[PDB]
């Protein structure tokens, strides 16, 4: 069982002030999406432009602004509600752009969800509003996931305002509308929804829930990969009709090898299809349960291992009182349930609604695969567990380094702390991996619960856009100025992104980034 | 294939217009994607008409429709729920219903079932289904229990009965006949019992259950509908006797059994259908 | 309701702090284990088991009083290399020492994994008599556990019995009966375990140990905590099912969980105390960490002798298919009489012996060795945590009668980076409002000791010390330190220690005081 590491570099309360904050009544931040040279920050009421090429003096000032408030009798009828006043606001959830030009906006309206269309040129209200039901949350604490593929809007979240309905809806398109069974506990129960990506056929998404192969015992949470084929239009009239016939999820294994596997099963946040020497992989973020001893670590996967776990076998629950075994092989319906009408092992059917009554009524009741899906290399990337915090945000630059040939993740916490890790991938690339920066990154005098939600990286300025629930912090990819003379503290660090110049100072993009040696190199004080 | 476990009344809209609502409540043997087990459908005066039995309110989200959760019946497999009466009483629909116990059963279907008599109550006016309530009924007599609801009539008890129980002339009255214990139902035992409930305390304990909700206190208590024990929340709304319901609260569940008031007992030859008149 | 955090040290003791302290050494000592009678406490360790009086107060250094010699022999030494064993490890290693009566002490070595058994007289530690064998009585490796113990003039053994180190068993033997022994290579029995302590109460021995569990087979390879059970009185099975074999053999499994959505369960056994009065009702308080492949993290759960019993007299359990799911068994399939009752004793009295017991009753404990129920600790939660740090802990001692007053519980614990924690143990529900970690000392002496692994503890009472047990050294530890605060009304009475008290002349003794509640209230800083 591995150890803590200890950061090479620790930059605390007083060398960190020294950085841009944004704020705007407090703010009330809730997420973020880099466009182009544009970052955008919706939260309660309002939507904030700042401007990535306008180096920030002691505030970040934005630009444009959306603003969004929820109506008046809305702001009435959530009073009746029962719930609070602070609550009554408008909280944006979602924001996706369509095109090049117009933005689909979702905001909670106080527990009134509705959605709309702004255009990106000017911020403006044009059209008519539509029902952001099934598509936007009523709380503005819960979790949700939004995506656009092919005409096709796919959402995941909350429906009702009773929060007991979790339902992965598609709409918004020249088909109908399609959803999971409700309060069908073996197909989702007690869901947390956290991202979704378009790979191939499929749109696969990722989220935690509560584990039904663990029920012999405490209620544990576990991680799941799910997906859904694109041109599934429902089934037939007897079995999954107006539902999804294409649903298949399977288990993450994000374990510490040893006599004992230990798992980390709680899944905080996860990446965009990121190229990691050579193969699309998705790097992850998993802590532990909540009545547990504190501990996180980073476990990566790849979609190849993704697919190879769907063909694979099915999971069933033969008696009531017994254990989640494999579907035999022969009792797998023809055509292989999850497969896209029109594709593979299912070409002969032209839509999602010829598939066989057996087929369609499988997939009802065993949505789970039996495999879990491997990390890449086994064991996790990065681990840290004898602290009081847990970790949250995740941000990765896959083309770090002077020769971009290096994996540099960047993750958030719970204490406001936030760790810069030179992650080992590869064999042939280092040890194992470096923490190379402890950055205390919560600014107490123009903050407030120091919660880093989300991260975004800025590449193109050098810079990462550290968010927190009531203030976002533009924090610089490099401290080399904290060195700056001393070439031993320097390229001991073995950050990729400083170096040491022949000028004699430590600047940016001569190194030694794999070893670090001390060799031919003094001591300053 | 039963009969005698479904039931409903028509509900003739206003005149001159074609279209009369029906509330039909039916058992529907863990087919819950086919068939909804309480609906509001539609009537119309072409009897060709493929809207016929459409339900009075549809979107994707909720109906007046009211399936049984995927997730009750795998809980516990045969639960259903039979419907015995049904009458229409000032601006609502009622029904006497006799469900699967979710609590005094165990997951195993052995066949020790139990089972509980409840009343439930809609709106006429109620399009999404947020007016329903469901409370146990039953009576005592000499610490001999009656839970199992046999048959019910809605009458008027015309001018003796009513100046008895405090009641003005145009308020009615249900005569019940239940069965001892909570067990078997499919043959219960002989020992039945003709009780009372007057539809002022049926209103009452009803305003009293939904206004202790609408403060907030307890819970809605519905393990085969809700699932998840969801909260009373509490609100700033003032409940009247014709409160419809709202998109919280509901459907709200009834904590404490309403008695009733016991009038003829027969311990040798069992009792079975019932009605009434003045 | 959620999760405990690491408790804050009243006060702290660095090494230098506890460098001033005596040592006890002696060629490297190798000890295993001690024992207190009278004011002389005994110390077993590699070749040597010394003697140390406890009425000298020590000067620098506890010297021994007297010690007694046993080698191992020419012999047994070279079968011991020639085995292949290091020479570090063939010597005669002691880890049985108890007493039989009150003149003679059972004493066995390792002797280069070869076991052996002899008597002693305790007043000479002279070799009086004979060699007896030491097989299954006596270990054959220093590193692994052993548990022995007397009990009506019968040896209750627990260990492994062969070289290769593959035969964990429990044994009786040296009696008036004659041999009785668990089956050997039965995974279902006892598989791969470590021993800790046995107890003997009511008509049966209970044992304590930590093993690979079966009911925690769906996912990793993981030790549970156990309680055994034999009845004092076996015979052993007729000539079918388990002749000369355990039949009154019951076995559970130790809660130790805190309580919330998600419980967590500390399960693997470090040590454990003898049955201790905690108010009222007898007790045993044990120290529980989490698997070696986890996060560390380290419980003391503590339970009674009430709740033991009845999980035995509760239900068993069963696996009906190899791939499902651990069941419990019901109650009109238990044979007659209640297996695991002794005979002649309530259910079994119209039997004389166990072996006649009916082949229903004898091949149902066969199979059914295991209980159904857990045993649930007092509280319902743990009497105290710790989590946040890098260590674990081990070595475990109470107090059953701390204070001026002595109603109020106090529990000593050690741990593997040479550290000893003084908890002040809330034990029923009119206490403290929590379990109130008192003082955190370094006791290990890294100059004159040595992997500091802290071993085992006793507790001294009398002169008001705890001996504390490394693997090279032991350590002499007064318990209080009163005198560190002298003459700062404040700092004596917020420690809480019940042990000091504050006098009218104006400064900080053992045994007026406030260790209920510690209020700071009318008290100045001291400087
Ligand atoms: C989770 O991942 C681990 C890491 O590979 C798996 O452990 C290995 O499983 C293979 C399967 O045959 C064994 O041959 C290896 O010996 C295992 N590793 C070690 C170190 O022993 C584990 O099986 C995976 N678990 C799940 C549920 O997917
Ligand atoms: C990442 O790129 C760097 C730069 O090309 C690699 O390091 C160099 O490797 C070449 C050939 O392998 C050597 O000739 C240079 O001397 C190396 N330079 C330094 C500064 O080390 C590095 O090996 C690459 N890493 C991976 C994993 O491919
Ligand atoms: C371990 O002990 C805890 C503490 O009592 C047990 O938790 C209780 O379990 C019972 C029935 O098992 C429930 O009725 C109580 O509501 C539980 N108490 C709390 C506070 O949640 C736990 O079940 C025990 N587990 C085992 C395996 O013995
Ligand atoms: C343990 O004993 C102490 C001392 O007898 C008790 O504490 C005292 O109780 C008396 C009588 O109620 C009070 O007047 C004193 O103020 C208390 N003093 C102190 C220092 O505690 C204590 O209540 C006993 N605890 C239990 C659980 O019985």
């Known amino acids: 069982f591995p150890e803590d590491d200890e950061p090479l570099n620790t930059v605390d309360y007083h060398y960190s002030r020294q950085y841009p904050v944004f704020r705007g009544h407090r703010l009330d931040f809730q997420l973020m999406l880099k466009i182009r040279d544009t970052l955008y920050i919706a939260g309660r009421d309002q939507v904030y432009t700042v401007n990535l090429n306008d180096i920030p003096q002691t505030e970040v000032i934005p630009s444009k602004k959306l603003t969004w408030r929820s109506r008046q009798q809305d702001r009435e009828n959530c009073a009746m509600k029962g719930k609070h006043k602070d609550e009554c606001h408008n909280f944006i959830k979602v924001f996706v752009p369509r095109n090049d030009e117009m933005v689909f906006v979702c905001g909670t309206n106080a527990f009134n969800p509705m959605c709309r269309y702004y255009r990106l040129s000017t911020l403006e209200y044009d059209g008519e509003e539509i029902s952001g039901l099934a598509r936007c949350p009523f709380d503005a604490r819960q979790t949700n996931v939004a995506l656009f593929a092919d005409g096709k809007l796919y959402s995941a979240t909350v429906a009702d305002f009773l929060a007991s309905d979790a339902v992965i809806y598609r709409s918004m398109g020249d088909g109908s509308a399609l959803r999971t069974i409700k309060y069908d506990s073996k197909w989702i129960k007690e869901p947390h929804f956290l991202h979704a990506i378009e790979y191939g056929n499929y749109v696969y998404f990722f989220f935690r829930e509560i584990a039904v192969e663990h029920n012999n015992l405490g209620k544990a949470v576990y991680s799941r990969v799910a997906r859904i084929c694109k041109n599934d239009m429902g089934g037939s009239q007897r079995v999954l009709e107006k539902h999804w016939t294409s649903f298949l999820k399977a288990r993450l294994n994000c374990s510490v090898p040893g006599d004992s596997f230990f798992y980390f099963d709680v899944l905080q946040s996860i990446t965009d299809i990121i190229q990691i020497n050579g193969i699309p992989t998705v790097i992850g973020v998993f802590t532990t349960q909540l009545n547990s001893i504190p501990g996180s670590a980073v476990c990566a996967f790849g979609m190849d291992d993704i697919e190879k776990v769907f063909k694979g076998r099915f999971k069933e629950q033969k008696t009531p009182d017994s254990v989640w075994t494999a579907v035999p092989e022969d009792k797998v319906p023809k055509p292989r349930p999850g497969c896209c009408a029109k594709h593979g092992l299912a070409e002969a059917y032209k839509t999602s609604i010829d598939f066989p009554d057996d087929t369609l009524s499988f997939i009802k009741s065993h949505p789970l695969m039996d495999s879990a899906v491997p990390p890449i290399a086994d064991e996790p990337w990065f681990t840290k567990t004898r602290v009081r915090y847990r970790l949250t945000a995740i941000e990765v630059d896959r083309s770090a380094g002077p020769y971009q040939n290096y994996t540099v993740i960047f993750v958030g916490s719970e204490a406001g702390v936030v760790l810069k890790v030179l992650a080992k991938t590869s064999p042939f690339s280092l040890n194992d991996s470096v923490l190379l920066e402890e950055i205390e990154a919560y600014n107490p005098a123009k903050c407030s619960d120091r919660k880093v939600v989300s991260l975004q990286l800025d590449r193109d300025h050098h810079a990462l856009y550290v968010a927190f629930s009531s203030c976002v912090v533009r924090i610089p990819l490099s401290r080399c100025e904290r060195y700056g003379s001393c070439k031993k503290s320097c390229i001991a660090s073995r950050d990729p992104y400083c170096g040491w110049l022949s000028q004699g100072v430590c600047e940016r993009v001569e190194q030694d980034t794999e070893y670090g040696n001390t060799a031919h190199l003094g001591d300053c004080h | ?278």
């Open chain 2, 1 to 278: 294939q039963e009969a005698g476990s479904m039931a409903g009344v028509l509900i003739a809209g206003p005149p001159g217009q074609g279209q009369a609502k029906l509330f039909v409540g039916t058992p529907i043997d863990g087919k819950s994607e086919y068939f909804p087990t309480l609906s509001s459908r539609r009537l119309m005066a072409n009897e060709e008409d493929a809207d016929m039995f459409g339900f009075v309110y549809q979107d994707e989200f909720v109906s007046s429709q009211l399936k049984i959760p995927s997730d009750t019946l795998s809980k516990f497999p045969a639960f259903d729920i039979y419907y015995v009466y049904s009458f229409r009483s000032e601006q609502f629909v009622y029904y006497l219903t006799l469900q699967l116990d979710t609590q005094l059963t165990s997951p195993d279907a052995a066949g020790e079932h139990f089972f509980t008599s409840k009343i439930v109550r809609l709106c006429v006016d109620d399009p999404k289904f947020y007016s329903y309530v469901e409370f146990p009924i039953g009576c005592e007599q000499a610490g001999v229990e009656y839970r199992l609801v046999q048959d019910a009539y809605l009458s008027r008890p015309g001018r003796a009965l009513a100046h008895q129980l405090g009641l003005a002339e145009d308020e009615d009255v249900l005569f019940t006949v239940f069965a001892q214990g909570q067990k078997n139902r499919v043959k219960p035992p002989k020992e039945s019992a003709l009780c009372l409930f007057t539809l002022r305390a049926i209103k009452e304990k009803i305003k009293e259950r939904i206004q202790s909700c609408y403060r907030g206190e307890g819970k809605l208590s519905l393990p085969w509908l809700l699932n998840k024990e969801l909260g009373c929340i509490n609100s700033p709304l003032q409940i009247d006797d014709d409160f419809c319901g709202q998109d919280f609260n509901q459907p709200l569940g009834g904590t404490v059994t309403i008695e009733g008031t016991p009038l003829f007992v027969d311990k040798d030859d069992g009792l079975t259908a019932v009605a009434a008149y003045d």
